[PDB]
Design a protein around this ligand. Structure first.
Ligand SMILES: Cc1noc(C)c1S(=O)(=O)Nc1c(N2CCC(NCc3ccc(C(F)(F)F)cc3)CC2)c(=O)c1=O
Ligand SMILES: [Mg+2]
Ligand SMILES: [Zn+2]
Lengths: 248, 199, 153, 69, 1340
């Protein structure tokens, strides 16, 4: 692939295959030129090496990459993907995050969500909802309305937000309480407001901790967050019958 | 160190007092970091071994179960009997101090009014159904597991008890201290000790 | 292989020593080969000479200038359009490794940041399906003779 | 030991995730193993519902239908 | 008291007097660099030592030699500012003189022609700022000092764990400064081994055999010989009486018609004394005794000419008979004593495969270079270039001295390579320690860990640049031409420039200066690191080296070290601590001759210190210098207890020498728990500089020295009076005494204004002196960011109350009154650099043009004719800053679109909008625009307008300086001509320039005037020589990278207020995120009606035992109290005496303190200035471990009419009613750390996706998505969220089709997902199928 400045970048396979291809053709040629046994064996030996390096560089002398000192990555190494090994884990859409602060007013089942975040998150819901209510002509039309942050969209947003809960996650996810669902209450600010009783499970303070938020798109998922992951359902701990939602 | 920090924090700690205070602190911090890293490595290995373990059967109907008694260490009890039985289903019907009268029938789930009934009576030993005992092939029977949930009822079909089990163990693992988190690691890993005893 | 050819074209009767005659043929097959397979993106022979030549002019002017020559300085030494140098320098680079680890020494590699530009956005994919629906409502509103004729043009 | 216990698995997909991948993969291949799925991780990788929970309802239906009529 | 001091004196507490003050904090950096770049006329480290090492470079016996003369550094191309503005490096070019000599063949050292080639250029080397930073590419950067193992020899153990037997083995390592390692180690069976570097193990006699030692001679080296004689017939033994210690007798040991020890009795200290006094030298022994005794040298039968026995071979009873009948009178055995003199070398010889000198050489070659065929030239040349060649090996003096010191030699300096003796003696030592006598040295100890910094590290890199050029010269002198080439043709500056640039650029020890704070700067420069080259990695070590060592005391700080994964690998340097001449850390001490404490300072190494007994700083001594108590607490050898009066050899310099500068700035430290201290000390650094510099009421006393030494502030060079002040510049009319005879002088100081910092904050200066003020040498002329009148001001003091306020201070969250957000006092300014790049693509070039497609007039209206936004224009998110367009024609549109193009009939664009626009959310004021065009490419309208304004601006500053300088010279002349020829009115009536034409009578005054005239024209000439250069730099085409036609950098200044989500903290490790901003009314208020600024939770104090934060709050209350009393008197306008009395009362409070005060200070003009400066509160200093006691605080509270409690009754602003119990209130210095929520918040609906893995990726302002890991997957698995999991890592990520099919449904109003397969797997399939494996998807 091209880059900026006219620079080019490539996967290390291309280097390796090139070696197979070249040594394979050099040999095809020597068979008709009637080379002496010493050379064809030598070439037959080299071809073995290039192939072995393509598939699993490492079980031999380990060929190093073009100019760069570092050795090239062979097919078998792309099959793993974790150099013990790395945990994770993939990146997801409809998701955000920020610093968390308090929020004593909340009920157990709700959470505080910045106005701005909410907007950018539910964007597609909002777009359809405008043109389903005839405020926007087309989709392109809604695109711009929400860009302008017209007073009418703030009303529409309260609608797509009503019975639609979000999920909130904290740094290490030890037990399943690491992710819990909340009904979103709209907030002016840029801070996520969390219920004080739930802090315990999450192991959250307000010493600068941060949490992420996820939107359950499909319907089944909305319900799965209302019936299983909803803050109110997880009142007791699954490690021992005693309640985790404890006055702090 | 033989001479301890005689002063406190309302008082001032002098130079040699602080300097010595330091090591304890620095070791502490490092120690928590490592104990955080190791608690997760366990859980990872734990979830690996469980994972696929799901509540499949409704009731495998075996009578085989383990025998529950209060822990009782040394002089007096370290953890009482009520806690160990609560929420577990009974393997066979237990009786009062005098027989002929069964207080609780064959496989009844022992809850709060039952435990209070088994505390009203001097009952001290109970045989209970366990996942280790459960016949069920490829899964665990609903009855054998018990109930515990964030819901107060018996466990439902299809819940991945395995994963939830794992999580439960390594999560508070950060708090732990032969012994400590590494001892726990050794137990699960089933390691033979240096000088073993033959029977 | 450059040897394997010196042996066929050899004539001992010319009294030429085989130890130097082949030296030309072996040295010929080696340097011709580097020209074809040493590069990921193959460039022609006249292009490699051009390149090497410029590193010779740069050497001369390196401490000669006190710092280093301007892109349009070497341009003057050279018979060619002299701007071509910019094009030459750009092609002559050779691709950088996609698996080159970037900062924090993390498993984060170069390729992980190359975004896909060929793709079509979802926000866009919708407006198009929507433009289909909108032009239809408009076409059906017209007279049938007019719609069929428009859809043809 | 759990670490050894986790090693035995019917599902070569699930195996390749944590064990040594070359080894798992080599051995499965010679054998001509067939992963029937039925397990948590293996379905996640391949991308279908989990054989537990909500998905439990569906997976139970797919299993009986398999090798039936 | 000095002119800046006189304005605001901070009241100091604490008894102890400072005998030694804080030395120039940034010394380590500035001293280091100096030695590297200094012209030294000896072999001491530096560029000179660098050249001398690799030179001369002589041809392979070709007798053509290139030799080094001398180097030079030409003045830089650009100054520091130009460097940062343009964006290049600040370096001086290296011009070195080289001599090429060609020798005659064949004459004994006769030279043909020699060319003394002029100074050839071999690269530029970047230069250090007065602050110790390097500008690398227009960015200030710091090179962190390294802490590594000192070179030489060190012996270790590795007890117990080695093989689990218990035994403990012993290793010896010979680590040089450059060259291979040589290891000597014991195996379990007591045999000695060796390994070069970490390679294969070999028996230790092989290396001696390689040095030309025969079996006979090696046994001759290590062991003592025991002589056996066969006088008359059958045996006799030469005896030394001491030899028989730790042995039980085997036979009847009788001598001289007397029996000393009977058969089977242990020879003890008694049998040894008796034989010793008697003088017994020969005793008779039996034949059977030498059945195991090993023979030392070979023995042969003379007659046959055959070998009876070889050296190091056990004797048998038949063998004894053989050498005796062959007529051998003596035998040489070994003295093998199991406990004392073990036969370890004797048993190793038996393991040894080799037999001679070559055999050894071959074996060692075969280990080092295995597989390849060993030659003779090779094996010999390899062994010599391992430890004996000056090129490939150098112990360095540091190492040489340490090496000799460990073997206990008389010397301190020797060679750089190992002698035969060096290797032998090292062995001889390692063997003593196994036998007994000898202790192994621990690594952790700071006498074995050495410290390296910038200068030396770079000298090391320049050597590597030379060794590789050495290769080019040798390669060239090979094909040698005669007097045609010159040393210039062959020396290539690029690899030299490349290597130095890499070191300063990409290096672990080089990084961007922590520039968000003046502590951040100063602490960064003083950072130590065990990391990098020649240092361990996080994963390799090893809690033993991380931890606090006793030798750390007063050398490194026990607390300032990171919480992260590298705790204890970093550390910050102790205040008074310096770098030793050989490179060790030494801390200063007071000499105690007999019983009196001198005022003489002695600096001590980690080992010097170990011997002496040192008295605590925390000691009591009076009068001449006598200790008050007979018993004083002292530390001696690693431990500390109570000691005798006349016994101490030394005493600590200060209460603060154990901590670091960042630690010395935490008040009442003593009252904080080390765990929380560490965090605050780290947190102080992350403080962003406020809009208005406050100054702490509660300080410690460093605050000033910290601000001065860091160059954020502007300090006096010479002292005089202020001629002109201006937000722009300050000019000082120098005092005659400090002045220089010629060229008069008036110092002009130019202030740094509203510019960007490395952490995108705002680094700006301000004039603190006003017109016509007398200044002293070393006073602050201007303040810098987060500095108030000379003192360090990272934050601002707040009125604080401790109480739970309905849960708005639940975890650590903080509650703040609007009054703080109104006063704009925690407001902070941020500056951003945003560049638009105009490049060349294959489709054509990119245009920076005002004409952009699909944009409303209103959008374009913010741009100038060229397409570049106007300076001063207030912009918001989305607004176009630089209009750019990228060529892209032949779109190929759809038929529905084609219809639309006929209807509205719009012309389609062959260009794409690539303009730079304000990132979403951010909003500020454009404050500068810089254009950089490629040379040769035509400058646009805006580009030139800027060049013009600059030239004008350049000519103005230049001329104005010259103008002030002219008057300064001419004023000096008027005073010189009047002192001997006064014409006070007669003089100024003629033109000022025609004065130079007047002479004077016979004096040096005639010479002084001559000097001023001379300096007058050098100024005239320099002004013109500068204006030329400045003009050139403005006009000249900035060199741009490939592809790029031109670049537009816009600088945006955003004013960020303070909101919920922002992080705040105090100096005592108390974190906190502001929770809710509240109305003024609702605030808890006291009886006077004055509300609290910030409400804090009291629960964060018992748990996190940082108790000093409370004392901050009480002493802060007392502090502000004194100010209120003064503000009261100031408002009533009492009088000079009334204010004097109270103030003098205040600076005396506490009893027996070191403060001191007036009356000397001038009743008027002076006292009133101080008064006004105190009305905001009275600044107080609490030394670190010499702090102010509870009592002193309570009395200062009494003096402000405040309660001793420190507690007041308060009322809720909401209900008006009283809170039961009194709550603590007072003032606490609080910071704003740059973790602002504005930066932290992120969100994404749909967006961009990566090329390989079709996975969310951010680029076009719009950030990537959040990472949903395995861990979280388990979470959903634990619930029943099967659909939540499916949509999560299918449609919301890798599913290239489903992802859009979803988005389409959502807008259509359908909550359905159509799953399908993720790419992540789909790819795996192709990847393994491209191995020979077939994977398939089975069944229906
Ligand atoms: C998220 C997440 N958290 O846990 C899970 C699991 C997920 S995932 O379902 O999205 N799967 C995911 C990934 N790959 C790629 C690497 C591959 N591991 C080795 C392997 C297994 C099976 C074979 C076979 F047998 F199929 F050939 C070959 C190689 C596993 C699958 C990622 O990366 C990644 O993020
Ligand atoms: Mg926290
Ligand atoms: Zn069961």
């Amino acid at each position: 692939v091209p880059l900026d400045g006219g620079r080019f970048a490539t996967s290390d396979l291309n280097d390796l295959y090139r070696r197979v291809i070249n040594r394979n053709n050099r040999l095809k040629r020597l068979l008709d030129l009637a080379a002496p046994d010493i050379i064809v064996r030598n070439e037959k030996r080299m071809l073995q090496e290039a192939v072995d390096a393509l598939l699993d560089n490492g079980r031999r002398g380990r060929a190093i990459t073009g100019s760069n000192k570092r050795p090239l990555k062979s097919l078998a190494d792309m099959i793993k993907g974790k150099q013990r090994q790395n945990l994770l884990g993939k990146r997801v859409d409809y998701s955000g995050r920020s610093v968390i602060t308090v929020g004593p007013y909340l009920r157990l089942h709700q959470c505080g969500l910045p106005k701005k975040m909410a907007l950018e998150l539910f964007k597609p819901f909002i777009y359809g909802k405008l043109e389903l209510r005839g405020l926007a002509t087309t989709i392109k039309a809604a695109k711009k309305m929400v860009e302008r942050e017209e007073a009418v969209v703030w009303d529409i947003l309260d609608e797509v937000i009503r019975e639609h809960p979000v999920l909130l996650n904290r740094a290490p996810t030890l037990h399943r309480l690491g992710i819990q669902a909340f009904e979103p209450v709209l907030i002016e600010g840029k801070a996520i407001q969390l219920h004080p009783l739930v802090c315990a499970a999450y192991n959250a303070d307000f010493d600068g901790d941060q949490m992420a938020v996820h939107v359950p798109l499909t319907l089944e998922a909305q319900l799965e967050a209302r019936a299983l992951m909803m803050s109110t359902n997880n009142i007791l701990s699954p490690a021992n019958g005693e309640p985790i939602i404890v006055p702090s | 160190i033989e001479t301890p920090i005689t002063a406190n924090f309302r008082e001032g700690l002098n130079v040699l007092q602080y300097f010595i205070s330091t090591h304890g602190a620095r070791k502490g911090l490092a120690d928590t970091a490592l104990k955080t890293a190791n608690s997760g490595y366990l859980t990872r290995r734990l979830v690996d071994v469980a994972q696929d373990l799901v509540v499949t059967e409704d009731d495998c109907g075996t009578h085989e179960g383990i025998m529950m008694t209060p822990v009782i260490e040394g002089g007096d009890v370290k953890e009482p009997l009520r806690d160990r039985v609560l929420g577990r289903v009974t393997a066979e019907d237990v009786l009062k101090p005098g027989t002929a009268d069964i207080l609780v029938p064959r496989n009844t789930l022992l809850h709060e009014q039952w435990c209070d009934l088994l505390e009203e009576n001097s009952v001290d030993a109970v045989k209970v159904r366990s996942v280790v005992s459960c016949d069920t092939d490829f899964g665990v029977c609903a009855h054998c597991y018990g109930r515990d949930l964030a819901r107060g009822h018996i466990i439902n079909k299809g819940e991945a008890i395995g994963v939830i089990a794992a999580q439960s163990i390594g999560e508070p693992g950060t708090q732990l201290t032969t012994g400590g988190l590494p001892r726990v690691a050794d137990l699960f890993e089933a390691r033979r000790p240096k000088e073993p005893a033959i029977l | 292989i450059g040897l394997m050819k010196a042996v066929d074209k050899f004539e001992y009767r010319r009294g030429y020593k085989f130890s130097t005659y082949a030296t030309w043929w072996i040295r010929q097959a080696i340097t011709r080969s580097i020209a074809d397979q040493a590069r990921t993106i193959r460039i022609p022979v006249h292009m490699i000479e051009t390149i090497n030549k410029l590193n010779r002019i740069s050497r001369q002017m390196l401490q000669e200038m006190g710092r280093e020559p301007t892109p349009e300085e070497l341009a003057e030494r050279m018979l060619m359009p002299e701007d071509k140098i910019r094009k030459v320098l750009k092609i002559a680079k050779e691709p950088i490794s996609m698996e080159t680890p970037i900062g924090d020494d993390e498993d984060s590699h170069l390729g992980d940041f190359i975004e896909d530009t060929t793709l079509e956005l979802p926000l866009d994919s919708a407006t198009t399906e929507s433009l289909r629906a909108a032009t239809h409502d408009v076409l059906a509103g017209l007279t049938a003779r007019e719609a069929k004729v428009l859809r043809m043009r | 030991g759990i670490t050894k216990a986790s090693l035995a698995t019917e599902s070569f997909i699930s195996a390749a995730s944590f064990q040594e991948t070359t080894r798992v993969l080599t051995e499965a291949a010679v054998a001509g193993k067939r992963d029937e799925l039925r397990g948590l991780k293996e379905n996640v990788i391949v991308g279908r519902l989990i054989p537990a929970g909500t998905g439990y309802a569906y997976h139970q239906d797919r299993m009986r239908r398999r090798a039936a009529g | 008291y000095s002119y800046t001091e006189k304005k605001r004196i901070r009241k100091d507490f604490g008894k102890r007097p400072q005998v030694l003050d804080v030395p120039y904090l940034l010394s380590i950096q500035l001293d280091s660099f100096q030695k590297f770049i200094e012209q030294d006329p000896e072999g001491q480290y530096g560029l000179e030592a660098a050249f001398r090492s690799v030179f001369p470079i002589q041809s392979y016996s070709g007798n053509s030699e290139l030799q080094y003369v001398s180097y030079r550094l030409g003045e830089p191309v650009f100054d520091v500012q130009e460097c940062q503005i343009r964006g290049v490096t600040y370096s001086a070019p290296l011009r070195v003189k080289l001599r090429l000599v060609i020798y005659e063949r064949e004459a004994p050292e006769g030279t043909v022609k020699d060319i003394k080639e002029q100074e050839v250029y071999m690269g530029e080397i970047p230069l250090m700022t007065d602050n110790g930073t390097f500008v690398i590419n227009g960015t200030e950067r710091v090179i962190v000092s390294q802490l590594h193992r000192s070179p030489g020899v060190f012996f270790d153990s590795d007890k117990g764990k080695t093989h689990s037997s218990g035994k403990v083995l012993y290793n010896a390592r010979i680590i040089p400064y450059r060259g291979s390692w040589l290891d000597f180690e014991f195996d379990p069976k007591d045999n000695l081994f060796v390994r070069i570097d970490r390679r294969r193990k070999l028996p230790a006699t092989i290396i001696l055999r390689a040095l030309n030692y025969t079996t006979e001679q090696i046994l001759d080296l290590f062991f003592e010989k025991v002589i056996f004689e066969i006088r008359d017939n059958k045996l006799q033994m030469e005896l030394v009486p001491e030899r028989l210690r730790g042995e039980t007798a085997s036979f009847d040991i009788e001598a001289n018609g007397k029996v000393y020890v009977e058969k089977g009795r242990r020879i003890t200290a008694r049998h040894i004394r008796q034989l010793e006094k008697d003088d017994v030298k020969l005793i008779e022994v039996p034949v059977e005794y030498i059945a195991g005794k090993v023979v030392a040298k070979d023995y042969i039968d003379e007659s046959t000419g055959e070998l009876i026995c070889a050296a190091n071979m056990e004797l048998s009873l038949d063998l004894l008979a053989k050498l005796s009948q062959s007529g051998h009178k003596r035998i040489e055995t070994l003295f093998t004593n199991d406990l004392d003199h073990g036969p370890y070398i004797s048993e190793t010889l038996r393991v040894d495969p080799t037999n001679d000198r070559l055999s050894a050489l071959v074996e060692i070659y075969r280990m080092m270079r295995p597989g390849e065929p060993p030659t003779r030239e090779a094996a010999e040349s390899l062994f010599e270039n391992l430890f004996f060649s000056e090129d490939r090996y150098d112990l360095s003096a540091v190492g040489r001295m340490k090496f000799n010191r460990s073997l206990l030699r008389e010397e301190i300096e020797g060679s750089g390579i190992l002698s035969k003796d060096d290797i032998i003696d090292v062995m001889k030592k390692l063997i003593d320690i196994r036998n007994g006598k000898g202790e192994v040295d621990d690594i952790d100890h700071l006498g074995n860990r050495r410290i390296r910094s910038v200068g030396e590290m770079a000298e090391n890199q320049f050597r590597v640049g030379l060794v590789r050029v050495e290769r080019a010269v040798k390669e060239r002198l090979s094909l040698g031409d005669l007097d045609t080439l010159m040393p210039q043709d062959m020396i290539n500056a690029k690899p030299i420039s490349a290597a130095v640039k890499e070191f300063f650029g990409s290096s672990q020890l080089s990084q961007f200066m922590d520039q968000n704070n003046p502590l951040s700067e100063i602490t960064h420069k003083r950072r130590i690191s065990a990391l990098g080259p020649g240092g361990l990695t996080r994963e390799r070590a090893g809690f033993e080296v991380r931890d606090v060592h006793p030798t750390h005391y007063g050398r490194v700080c026990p607390i300032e070290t990171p919480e992260g994964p590298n705790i204890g690998l970093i550390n910050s340097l102790s205040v008074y601590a310096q770098t030793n001449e050989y490179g060790f850390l030494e801390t200063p001490y007071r000499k105690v001759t007999d019983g009196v404490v001198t005022d003489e300072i002695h600096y001590l190494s980690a080992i010097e210190e170990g011997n002496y007994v040192i008295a605590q700083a925390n000691s009591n001594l009076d009068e001449e210098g006598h200790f008050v108590e007979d018993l004083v607490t002292c530390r001696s050898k690693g431990e500390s207890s109570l000691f005798s009066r006349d016994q101490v050899d030394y005493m600590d310099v200060s209460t603060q020498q154990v901590v670091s500068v960042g630690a010395s700035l935490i008040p009442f430290l003593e009252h904080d728990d080390a765990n929380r201290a560490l965090m605050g000390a780290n947190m102080q650094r992350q403080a962003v500089p406020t809009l208005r510099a406050d100054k702490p009421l509660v300080g410690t006393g460093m605050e000033r020295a910290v601000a001065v030494d860091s160059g954020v502030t502007a300090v006096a060079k010479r002292g005089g009076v202020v001629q002109y002040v201006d937000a722009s510049r300050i000019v000082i009319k120098v005092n005659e005494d400090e002045m220089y005879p010629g060229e008069a002088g008036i110092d002009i100081y130019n202030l740094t204004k509203y510019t960007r910092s490395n952490q995108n904050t705002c680094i700006n200066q301000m004039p603190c002196v006003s017109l016509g003020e007398p200044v002293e040498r070393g006073d602050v002329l201007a303040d810098g960011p987060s500095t108030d009148l000379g003192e360090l001001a990272l934050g601002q003091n707040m009125r604080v109350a401790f109480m739970p306020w309905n849960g708005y201070n639940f975890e650590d969250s903080i509650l703040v009154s609007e009054r703080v957000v109104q006063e704009d006092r925690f407001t902070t300014i941020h500056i951003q650099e945003l560049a638009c790049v105009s490049r060349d693509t294959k489709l054509g070039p990119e245009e920076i043009t005002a004409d952009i497609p699909n944009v409303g007039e209103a959008a374009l209206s913010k741009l100038d004719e060229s397409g570049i936004v106007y300076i001063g224009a207030e912009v918001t998110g989305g607004d176009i800053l630089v209009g750019k367009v990228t060529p892209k024609g032949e779109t190929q549109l759809t038929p529905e679109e084609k219809l639309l193009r006929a209807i509205f009939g719009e012309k389609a664009s062959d260009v794409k909008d690539s303009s730079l626009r304000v990132p979403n959310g951010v909003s500020g004021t454009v404050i500068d625009v810089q254009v950089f065009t490629r040379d040769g490419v035509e400058k646009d309208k805006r580009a030139l307008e800027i060049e013009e304004m600059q030239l004008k601006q350049a000519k103005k500053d230049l001329s104005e300086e010259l103008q002030i300088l002219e008057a300064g010279l001419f004023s000096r002349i008027r005073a010189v001509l009047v002192a001997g020829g006064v014409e006070a009115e007669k003089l100024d009536k003629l033109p000022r320039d025609r004065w130079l034409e007047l002479g004077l009578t016979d004096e040096e005054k005639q010479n002084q005037l001559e000097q001023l005239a001379e300096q007058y024209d050098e100024l005239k000439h320099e002004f013109e020589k500068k204006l030329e250069a400045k003009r050139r730099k403005i006009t000249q085409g900035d060199d741009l990278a490939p592809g790029v036609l031109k670049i537009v950098k816009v600088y945006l200044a955003v004013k960020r207020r303070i909101q919920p989500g922002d992080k705040m903290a105090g100096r005592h490790g108390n974190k906190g995120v502001i929770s809710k901003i509240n109305p003024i009314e609702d605030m808890p208020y006291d009886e006077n009606g004055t509300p609290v600024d910030i409400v804090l939770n009291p629960l964060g104090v018992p748990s996190r035992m940082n108790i000093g934060q409370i004392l901050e709050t009480h002493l802060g209350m007392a502090a502000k109290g004194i100010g209120d009393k003064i503000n009261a008197m100031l408002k009533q306008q009492q009088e000079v005496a009334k204010l004097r009395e109270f103030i003098q009362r205040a600076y005396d409070l506490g009893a027996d303190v070191r403060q001191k005060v007036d009356l000397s200070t001038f009743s008027d003009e002076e006292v009133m200035r101080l008064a006004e400066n105190l009305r905001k509160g009275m600044p107080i200093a609490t030394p670190v471990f010499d702090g102010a006691k509870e009592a002193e605080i309570k009395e200062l509270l009494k003096l402000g009419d405040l309660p001793t409690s420190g507690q007041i009754r308060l009322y809720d602003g909401r209900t008006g009613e009283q809170f039961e119990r009194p709550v603590t209130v007072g003032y606490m210095y609080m910071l704003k750390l740059n973790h602002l929520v504005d930066d932290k918040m992120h969100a994404r609906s749909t967006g961009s996706y990566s090329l390989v893995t079709q996975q969310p990726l951010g680029g076009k302002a719009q950030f990537g998505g959040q990472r949903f890991g395995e861990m979280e997957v388990w979470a959903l698995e634990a619930y029943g969220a099967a659909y939540t999991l499916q949509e999560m890592l299918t449609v919301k990520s890798d599913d290239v089709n489903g992802r859009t099919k979803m988005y389409k449904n959502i807008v259509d109003g359908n909550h359905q997902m159509e799953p399908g397969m993720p790419e992540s797997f789909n790819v795996l399939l192709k990847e393994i199928r491209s191995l020979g494996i077939n994977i398939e998807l089975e069944d229906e």
